[PDB]
Amino acid sequence: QQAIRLLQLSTLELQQELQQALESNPLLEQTDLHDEYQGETTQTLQDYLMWQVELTPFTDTDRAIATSIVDAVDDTGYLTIQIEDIVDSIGDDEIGLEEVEAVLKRIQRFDPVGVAAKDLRDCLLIQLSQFAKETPWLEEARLIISDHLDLLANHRTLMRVTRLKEEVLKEAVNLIQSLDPRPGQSIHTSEPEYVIPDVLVRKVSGRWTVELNADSIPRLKINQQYAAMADGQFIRSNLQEARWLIKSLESRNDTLLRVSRCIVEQQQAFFEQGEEYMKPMVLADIAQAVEMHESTISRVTTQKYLHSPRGIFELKYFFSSSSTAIRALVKKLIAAENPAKPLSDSKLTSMLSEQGIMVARRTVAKYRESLSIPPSNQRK
Amino acid sequence: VYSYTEKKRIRKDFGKRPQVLDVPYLLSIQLDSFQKFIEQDPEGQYGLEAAFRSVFPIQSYSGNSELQYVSYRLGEPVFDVQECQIRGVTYSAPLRVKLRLVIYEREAPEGTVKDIKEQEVYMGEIPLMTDNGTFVINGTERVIVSQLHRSPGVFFDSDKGKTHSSGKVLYNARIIPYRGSWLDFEFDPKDNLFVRIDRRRKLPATIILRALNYTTEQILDLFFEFTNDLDHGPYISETLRVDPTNDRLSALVEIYRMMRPGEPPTREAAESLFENLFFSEDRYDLSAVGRMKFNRSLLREEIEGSGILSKDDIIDVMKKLIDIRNGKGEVDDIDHLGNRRIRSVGEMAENQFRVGLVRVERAVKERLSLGDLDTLMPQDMINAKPISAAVKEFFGSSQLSQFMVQNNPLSEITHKRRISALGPGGLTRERAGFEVRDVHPTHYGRVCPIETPEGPNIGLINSLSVYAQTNEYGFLETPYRKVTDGVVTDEIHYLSAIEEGNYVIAQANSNLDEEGHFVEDLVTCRSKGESSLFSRDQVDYMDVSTQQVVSVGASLIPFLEHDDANRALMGANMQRQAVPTLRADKPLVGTGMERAVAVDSGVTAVAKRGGVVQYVDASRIVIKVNEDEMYPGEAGIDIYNLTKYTRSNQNTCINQMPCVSLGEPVERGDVLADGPSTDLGELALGQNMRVAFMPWNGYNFEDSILVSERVVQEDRFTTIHIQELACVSRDTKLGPEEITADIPNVGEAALSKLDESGIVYIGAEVTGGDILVGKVTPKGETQLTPEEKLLRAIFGEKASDVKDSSLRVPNGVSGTVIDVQVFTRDGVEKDKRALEIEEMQLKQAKKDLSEELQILEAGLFSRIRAVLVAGGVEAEKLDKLPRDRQLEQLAEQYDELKHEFEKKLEAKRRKITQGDDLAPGVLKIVKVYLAVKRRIQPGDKMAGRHGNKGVISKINPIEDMPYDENGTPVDIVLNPLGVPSRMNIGQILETHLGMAAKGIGDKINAMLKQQQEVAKLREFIQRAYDLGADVRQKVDLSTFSDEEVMRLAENLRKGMPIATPVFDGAKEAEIKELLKLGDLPTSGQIRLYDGRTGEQFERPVTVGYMYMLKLNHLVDDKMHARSTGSYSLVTQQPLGGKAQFGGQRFGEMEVWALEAYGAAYTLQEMLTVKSDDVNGRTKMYKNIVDGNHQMEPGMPESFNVLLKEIRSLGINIELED
Amino acid sequence: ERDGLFCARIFGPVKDYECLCGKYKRLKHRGVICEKCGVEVTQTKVRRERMGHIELASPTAHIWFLKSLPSRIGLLLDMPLRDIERVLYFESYVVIEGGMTNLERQQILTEEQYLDALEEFGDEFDAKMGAEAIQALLKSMDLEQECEQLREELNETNSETKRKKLTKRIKLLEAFVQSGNKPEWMILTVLPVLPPDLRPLVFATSDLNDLYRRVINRNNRLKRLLDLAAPDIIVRNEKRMLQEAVDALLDNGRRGRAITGSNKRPLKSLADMIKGKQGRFRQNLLGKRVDYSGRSVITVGPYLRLHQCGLPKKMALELFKPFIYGKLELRGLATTIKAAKKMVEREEAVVWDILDEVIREHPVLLNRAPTLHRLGIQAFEPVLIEGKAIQLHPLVCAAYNADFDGDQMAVHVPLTLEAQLEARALMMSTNNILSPANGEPIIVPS
């Protein structure tokens, strides 16, 4: 049962298990040992907001209240705590719940304006207070969001409630759409998380090479300076176990390579054009193609991921547990290109067979008729 | 006589010496060498055939699986040079290698079961050189500098003096193979002979010979007849006393314990080790150079032999060590060019490829050992990666492969021509002393004595020579003229470093009149390593030209012999830094080599053929080829596409300007257009102008330069900078990133200058923080809650659940967007913009492929028109009938050609779409470019060719400029005191002659300003090129002097281009004699008047036209300011330079200067509150704004780091008290 | 990954006051460690402070003391170098606690000698090798008896050569005794781990954590190999490699000079983090980079008085920016800081005059790239000049040895008030007219 547990663990989990196993028996990977500076910089996020509290006088007692707010600020820019919950954190009876509103607004007014505001209407309303600038359409605008009339815009239902004049109010709503809802969250240099590919797929010219595999595959060497051959039989028993191990490991990569060839061939229609619209291959169907037992192919299918030109996929999603999609393909193909020579019905069936989609010369005709387009009448 | 270029404008020449051998190809050392690399050579000549044949046939052990190599080929390049340069792929060719697998028979007289000779096995692609002498690996032209190493052979060194404090010196021999382990013999005061493999360790000599199966009786036999201290040293037998080993087995065991110490020795392991060092054919090599210099250095008769060492070689050279040791000489220095070998891209490419072949051979013997019978064929036991992992490791990353310097058209040429003693195989900069740095008399005519870098490496680079050529083996050649008896023959012989040493060679400048017999009683000659006057008839050879000693950067210095050597160095080296100008003015005083430069590099536009130009535009040039040059098939025309406003490695702008008017005959081998810094075939590194040497009230102090406002107004020294700002991401585990098309968090203005696709529009005012490309990115399935539905309702945006990843214009930077490239990873479309670039290239190609149609269809059309007439002639009815209406064959070729149009065009279109190819996970890349015009302004660097630097101090108006009698302003005011100190007097002549060279022009213009008859200007131009008596003018009137020479006027009305060869240039009475022509005084000085006063300056003032060079040091790129930036993480400190975002490094010497002064809080704040301290910086910042200037210093954070770093050892460090 | 070279439990939380599990997020709950994922909610800066430890299955020598010129492991035992080097390399046995059999207490043997000594004296005889041998040898050896033995011996022998090495060694020993370090501590049972933020990742384990990862790995193998009952050759050579890896991790380049993946340069060790670029001189001593500074090309000042120099306008706006903020909000030109910087970013014409106010009597500091004499740094008075180039006075130009051929100058702002005074007092131009080398004028026209 050592081989079966060996195959279907995550490629990251497998190497972790072998690393423990590698310590226990003397076998060695490629060490890249040939025997003969800065990855870091500063960044500011809420630290920017803390620049405010140091320079702006809160005295001492209120500054600690403001420092308690910035922690509650989400990456989105809004407080997780309730205004009475930060009151619990300070653990003082001199906050009054009024003073916290006094400081909370003042840190709201430092750029980004609108920041650190509960319920988002604050953020929009407290956006407007500084934004007021005496003008122009905001007086009617401040009414909508403040009155709880923020049911809209779900949709002129406002007109009955707001009583302002109709079409001119859109010159307010248009001005409302110019407010940033949630400053300032901005992109850090996180790649972000990239899923290390198991296998690989791409197409060299006029062909599909599923050859894989990324550098995930461990390269193990069983040879060391202990080639010397109760003590001695232990090293023979362990070397025997380690020689079986590399064999079982090499078979895993050999199986992944094979299974990948047959799962891409069966599904190529999805692979070639777009996503979904995958012919539902069954584990047994692939299990029939090659000797592998369905239990072994289900296991290898579980956690070993797949890189595709479009997206990355678990290889378990390839499994599952029509006319409209082909019509759009026909439309897309015939509408595309055809600069001088129209695309003949025979050519479409050839193109679709080449990509793996199976359609008859007669069915392409009926699909094109249902599209309402006459074949080949259009020309230069 | 003159080329169709000189028909436009000709450059006069000064001086005497005739040119027997014209200037050779400047790109030779590159093009010819890489040509010798990749070639089909039916013999052992170096190349792919060489490494390939030598590593082959690869045979297994007794398996008779031997894999044989036959031949090879390079498939047509997958992408052309122009397309591969835009995309960033490698410009290369597939290597198709014929292999033959013959399986033998089991225990027979070489039978064959079956032979699978399988068709081409594909091993990688290899980088192809251009006609520029350059390579394209990714997107950029790069150069591989030729190297210089110790020539394979036997080295004889000394190490006298300081070795051990006795002054008794030493005799240490050595052996330097091309491949394999080194060899050394080191002598000690104890005098015993010590042999060493590599640098490893010291062993008594007996361990080598006895290991070769030599008993004691045969040791003392070879090296002795004899104990004598003044003649025959008993050194071998004095070494034999410290000998531990009595026989072969013992010596081999001790060797195996030497090379690999710390492991139990055996017999068979030692035998294979020692036999695999200097003996085995696989590990050790000499080849053609090693046995050559080996023999000649050993005084041997045979000039060739095996590439391996034998007992006779070892004992031979060992005897040579004893001969040189006792009383006999002589020492061989490492300086002589006979001990120096040059390596070129071809040779090193063959070596790396060979490494790939041996590393794959190691894997071939295995699969051929353990395999079965006929199944596996070539393409099975041979892979691709083992090859490209070598050749790419060389071309891609190597100390000898450096980015081409593309700013200055002179820099590419002086780059591809170079020498480097550093790098692989040669001495480094941390070891080799002043010896190899200095100049050797053998450098004459080969290595440029002047042009070398100044800095940590001096003399470790140097340069080539104008006429220099690569020697057959490793050496350098110099051109020489054969002088037999008293007749100097026109045969140009080539002598190597050691060859030339023994002959007696005269000098290129020696006066011979009449039929070329030496007039002098005794001419100067160089016999051996020295120079002196020699007998009249004793001349063996004579130098070809006076320029053969110097290089391109040297020869391009006017009046070189006038300037001091140091300032000549500085000047020629500064010349390579000159930035391209907006308008290229040819130098008024040149060397004549400018044409030999501008043409020798791809910066210009050459001509495959000639004949009248068809279509001349600012983009393309179409030529009609004549019949004599044109090939019979396909006929054809010459289509040229000029590169317009493209980037460069220096952030400069490269652009082509068509120089042909229209409808004009051209000659093959002529310039159709002009690239950057090239004026009508003449190399223009910059512009010249009016200079006057006077003190101005102190803005000219030292090298500071005063420039008139007229210069910055006329927009001459202005340059065009192009920067490449690129953005690519997508592919996140949360889903792909989309490029713009919506970008929440920004208002209307940002989206206004971005196209509907989301790319920036072509052209814009872009500065500061603008958005070049919108870039988004998801986070996903945030729980909506009641709140986010409201959020997604009212705005909703994208829907904007997603962050802003955008590429934005870097702050403090600006420009204008010109060109945008997109590479879309295959399988992912783009909405519009990408389709617009694809379609744009498609139309640019389609209208071009119609030229081979409309021209050929019209010609074959007229051919139909001719044949049908004898067949039913109607001329007018032929005009009448439509164009669509032997007949067999002609009607056939029509259809075939049309179909060819179809398939060719379609192939090009698919080629446009398919290759974007990018990295895994890279989805879409956008390369955006920004072009700005950077003018001149105080602080910018400006210098001459003569070694005078400069920095513009103030830009003075046209008023304050001192002016002459006619009121002409001076362009640049420079300091007189710089010349008598720097000892560069060439800049004094280049000015004076300039005043003459400009003066004639100023007259010519005036004479054309009065629009006289064709005859008067004809006579005056006759006089202009006549001047002082002699040579070598070959004056005008040869062609038509009316319509043909009229254009020679318009080009002369600016100035009069003049050629001043290096040592053949002008002279005093020549300059004065040309100054007499228009009107000028002999002193070269006139009267000036201050524009701020109107009075006269006492004494004369030297004025003229001097050539100025604008380097790229420009202030705008340098000046920096930092108040508070981002800090470092590990140790909280300011960042990486003057360059963003950091601030100037305040060093320990600055701390010493602060320690000298009583300044205490200054140093304290310097290393505490300003930078290092974590809290002190912020608590200080909250002060500075408040208006209270004070500090709460605390302790530096990096000391708190040092505490933990020491605490990571077994050491404890605390803080007490 | 928990219990790795980077972990929250071993060191600290990734996010400020946040858990790895997410139960404890706000700064309400601080001191509490966790219910589930082991972490303590705390500032993230404690991840650059706290250290871990690695337990070695076998003892290990500290290569710093062995390779020191007066080798502290060998000279403490009065043992030579080449020998103790043979002992720790597992290339020979050493005798410890000789007892009464035949041999000495410190003597060195070989294989056939070791077994030959075991066949006759089977018990009451002890000889071993490796770091354990030097450990127990150093521990059993004590300095109490050597004081009296040495001193009395010094009285006994009548030659200087007899007692010279005696008094030398005995003084070294008793000073060692007073120090508080006992010799047993040069054999490391545990190893310290540098905080994660002092050896930051690039996601490529590097230089360092590469080394640490080697020592960890190869050591864990030994920890499992002892319990797995493996012969003497295997565990012997892997103990040797454990010593090798700790050697490289502590101070590389002493013997093996292991070099990181993709080669060729040897990976930097912990001593290389002290012995630095040229040294730790880079940061602590040489004061590294400094804020409120910048450079640009230098041109002529002929219109300047001796006490003043030119400065770029756009550069001065950045240099004095923190002063310009406060001076702006002090006049009421800007409400708060955010609007103040928002104004200086727009470069509104009102702020240049504010700058003119704070830059008038406020001195600056120039300097050249090379600095020799104390006059190499001279403070002048700033004069706003339009351009990107800095202007220097020609009289003091002879001090810097500054040619106008394209050299650059560095500027500095004396922020704290005392510094503002020291810049105009002892650092000014007029106050140094005479070179400290010679009392002759340094201002002399050129």
Ligand SMILES: [Mg+2]
């Ligand atoms: Mg200088």
Ligand SMILES: [Zn+2]
């Ligand atoms: Zn937790």
